[PDB]
Structure formats: structure tokens, C-alpha cells
């Protein structure tokens, strides 16, 4: 059929993970998405995590590249405290509350999309926020929300092959970005520098700058 996370071994989870979802390679060895309702929830979660991690990793990469040209930008792991210091008139509680309230508005919008797939493209919002559907055969809603506002440049309207290709690009880059952010957190814990700092340290001397030499991974060396 398609490519599997394990060539051969067709004992991939029973056909709730057939070659239908975008990014589907039969990887569910722990069965966390077996039932269809949980599978739909997991598809939403994976796309959202991929997009959010893509945003976060791009921000971390750029902020760590600026922090190497000497620009007055802190590293990603100290940006919160650095900002709180440099802007003393702001209250942590206020910023945390505002972030939770403004994030909450849009996340309730997305929640009531998940509950009723087409219910959010009406009332105050126009009709483009109704969603184009996608996975599980739904033709409305979903993690893919077309229209002229979330897809302003029309890069998935027209040419179904092009839409599928771009969907695959998004999903694979999202999985890569999630793995990359896990790497960022692990490298920061083990070494204590930025991501670009670690990359240039490694390329400057490829040896003696592996994970063995940081003294935290291989704990005894």
C-alpha cells in the first residue's frame, strides 16, 4: 500500500489508520488513537501542535540568530525574565491573565469548531471561518480552515494535487519542528547555551562537542 514506519510488519494497527490521513505511516504502536472520536481529536491535536511548534521553533531560531549579531535580544530560555526586567511597569499576573484571556477567545472558537464542525462560520464571523473539512471525510471545519483569511493567498484553493502536496509539506515540517523543539529543550538542559550557539560550537569542532562531552547525557563521563 503506502510507506510504513517499519518496512514490512503489516501488523500496523487495524484499519482505523489506513492510508487516508495526511501524514499517515501507520505509527500508533501504543494505540492512543484507536477509537474514531479519539482519532479525530488526535488529528486536531497533532496539526495544532505542529503549527505551534513550527511558530515557536522559528521564533527561537531567529531570536538566537539575532543574539549572535549582538542585537539586543535575549536567548529563548531567558526572554521572559529579561523582558520583565527591562519593562518594570508591567505585572506578571496581568500579562499572564491577558495572555490566557485573549488566547481563550480564539481557543473557544476552535473548541466549538471541534464540537460542531460548521457552527463557527456564522453569526459574528462571516462564512469563510466555517472550515473546509479534510480528515475523516468531513467537508466542513477541521484543522484546515480555508477562506480568504486563514488562506489569504489561495495556495490550497484550486488543484487538489497541489493542496495535497502542501498538506504533506505542512505535516512533515510540523513533525520535524516538534522534534526540533524537543531537541532545543534537551540541549538547553544538557549544555546551557542557545540552539544556534550549540550548532556553531559543533561545526567549529565536530569532535569533543558531541552529546557525550557535555557531562549530563552520559552522566559519568
Amino acid at each position: 500500500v503506502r510507506e510504513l514506519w517499519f518496512p514490512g510488519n503489516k501488523e500496523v494497527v487495524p484499519d482505523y489508520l489506513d492510508g487516508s490521513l495526511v501524514g499517515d505511516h501507520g505509527f500508533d504502536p501504543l494505540g492512543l488513537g484507536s477509537s474514531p472520536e479519539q482519532l479525530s481529536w488526535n488529528v486536531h491535536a497533532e496539526i495544532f501542535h505542529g503549527r505551534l511548534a513550527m511558530t515557536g521553533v522559528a521564533g527561537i531560531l531567529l531570536t538566537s540568530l539575532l543574539h549572535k549579531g549582538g542585537a539586543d535580544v535575549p536567548e529563548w530560555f531567558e526572554a521572559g525574565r529579561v523582558y520583565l526586567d527591562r519593562n518594570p511597569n508591567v505585572d506578571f499576573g496581568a500579562l499572564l491573565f491577558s495572555t490566557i484571556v485573549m488566547s481563550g477567545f480564539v481557543e473557544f472558537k476552535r473548541l466549538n469548531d471541534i464540537r460542531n464542525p460548521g457552527s463557527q462560520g456564522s453569526g459574528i464571523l462571516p462564512e469563510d471561518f466555517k472550515g473546509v473539512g479534510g480528515p475523516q471525510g468531513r467537508t466542513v471545519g477541521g484543522p484546515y480552515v480555508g477562506g480568504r483569511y486563514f488562506d489569504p493567498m489561495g495556495l490550497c484553493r484550486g488543484s487538489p494535487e497541489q493542496t495535497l502536496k502542501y498538506k504533506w509539506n505542512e505535516i512533515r515540517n510540523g513533525r520535524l519542528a516538534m522534534m526540533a523543539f524537543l531537541g532545543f529543550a534537551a540541549q538547553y538542559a544538557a549544555t546551557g547555551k542557545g540552539p544556534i550557539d550549540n550548532l556553531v560550537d559543533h561545526v567549529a569542532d565536530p569532535f569533543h562537542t558531541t552529546f557525550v562531552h557535555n557531562g549530563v547525557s552520559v552522566p559519568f563521563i
Partner: protein, 231 residues
Amino acid sequence: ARANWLPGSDFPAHLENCKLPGCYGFDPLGLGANEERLAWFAESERVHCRWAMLGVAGILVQEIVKPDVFWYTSGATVELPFDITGLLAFELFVMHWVESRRGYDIKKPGSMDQDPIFSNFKLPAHEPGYPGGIFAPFVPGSLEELKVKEIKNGRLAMLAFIGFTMAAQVTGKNPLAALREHLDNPLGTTIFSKAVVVPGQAVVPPCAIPDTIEFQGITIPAGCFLHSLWP
């Protein structure tokens, strides 16, 4: 067989049988796949071409007549007959009028064609983005050929203006000054000489335009696009 952006290649599909001028079958990313977006992007390209033509011509002439003024910094070092606040407000109002009219005209063709003040005056029917009439007094040659000529020149002008900006960032002098600097030593002024990266070292050119500037008290964060990302 026909004119191609890459001889030997085939056109996509939307770009096959264009009615837009300058169709050389580009779009390696599929932005013109849609057909409303294709017309919107065609108008955007035309206005970008014309604004960049005006910009590059103005920069060239201003450099020719006033070589002691850096075009990049000339916004703040020029001595305006008026103020800068009211000048920008006048700019804002006039451009709002004309640009809103043009944008609407593109949105719906048979619309922004009638003079408000004088009822009798009215633009004769035109294709989008080519008003003609009062806007086109003299027409030197066949219209389609001249549209192709305009599109070619506009492409070259937009590339030239981005080059102007970049040379101003890295070299710090006006375009013809940079050309004279490259012509006295062609081997040594190229970006390959000024900047280079290898595994273990990165040599990047400094930005001649300073980090900040002073203008009537306030400071405008005018740096160098994105330093550190330069090769």
C-alpha cells in the same frame, strides 16, 4: 518553443495561454493557480513595476544632480520647504483618494470611471490596470508590444531598486558611486570578495548605515534590513 523563462521547459497550466503581458511561464510556486488571485496579482505587479520605475529613475537622477546626498538617508537630510507632519498628512489623504479609486476599479471594472466634479467627463471603457484616455495622451506604437516593453522594463526596475537598497546597505554610497567602485577593481568589489562563509568561520560585511538616526528629536530605527543574516 515559445518565449520561456527557462528554455526547454514547459508551462504549468494557468500560465499556459496567458492574456497578461510578459507571460514567460514563471510561477515556480503556484501563486497564480487561482484566477481571482491571478488578476489581483497582475495588478499588483503592474503598480509595483511602475512605482519601481519611478523610484529607480528618481534615484538615478537625484544621484546625478546632487551627488553629495545619500539616497538612503536623503529622507531625513533634505530640508523640506514644509513640515514633515503636514507633508505626510497631505500624502496620506491624496494617496488614499487615488489608490482607493484604483483598487475599487480593479475590484469591479465598470465603476470608478466617472469624474465626480464634472458629469460629462468620464474614462472611456478600459481593461483593468490600463486606464488610457486622459492617462494616456500619446501612444508610441502598438499597444500590446508596448505593454510587453513596459512589463520588461518594470521587472528590471524592481530588481534594480532592490539592488540599490542592498548596495546602499553594504557599500553605503549611491548606485553610480558603487558602480564606479566596482569598475576600478572588478576582482575585489563583488559580494564574493566582501562576504563568505565556511564551516568554522563567517566573514560578513559591516553595515555602513548606522543603527539609529536623529530626526527632529525622535530616532527612527533605521538599521540594515536584517544584519547577521548576511553571508
